[PDB]
Amino acid sequence: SRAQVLALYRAMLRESKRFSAYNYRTYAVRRIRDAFRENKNVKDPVEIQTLVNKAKRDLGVIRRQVHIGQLYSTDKLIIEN
């Protein structure tokens, strides 16, 4: 299931970088990377499947929130210049 996890990681990273807000984008990218690295050595397939399902639900939430934030967007932060 290595390929499935890698594809899910890639999709989660790609969708999170489309966040319009700076805080949400940075937090989502950092949290996804940290969460995937912290579970790198999990061996139990049941726990792996539970983590995969949690990541899928989080990906759906990220897609919806990214789009709705694109619908209602504001100016960039002073640090993004």
């Binding site: 890698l6 990273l13 790609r14 990377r33």
Partner: protein, 74 residues
């Protein structure tokens, strides 16, 4: 220069001090990079150059030379 930019991107992504990257250095063995860092490197390559890499061609990108050839070809 594409040659400098690709190596520089790899240097940011893997923390290589800009010295370790060569034209024959692999991502996994030579440098510190698991699959999670290689996915992040491929995405960074897709960002610096606005070229989207297919998954089949992304699998082929395992060394610095593969990325160099892919970027020069496209």
């Amino acid at each position: 220069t594409i040659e400098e930019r690709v190596k520089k991107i790899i240097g940011e992504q893997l923390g290589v001090k800009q010295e370790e990257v060569t034209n024959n250095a692999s991502f996994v063995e030579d440098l510190g990079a698991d699959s999670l860092d290689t996915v992040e490197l491929v995405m960074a390559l897709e960002e610096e150059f606005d070229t989207e890499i297919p998954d089949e061609e992304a699998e082929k990108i395992t060394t610095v030379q593969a990325a160099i050839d892919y970027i020069n070809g496209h």
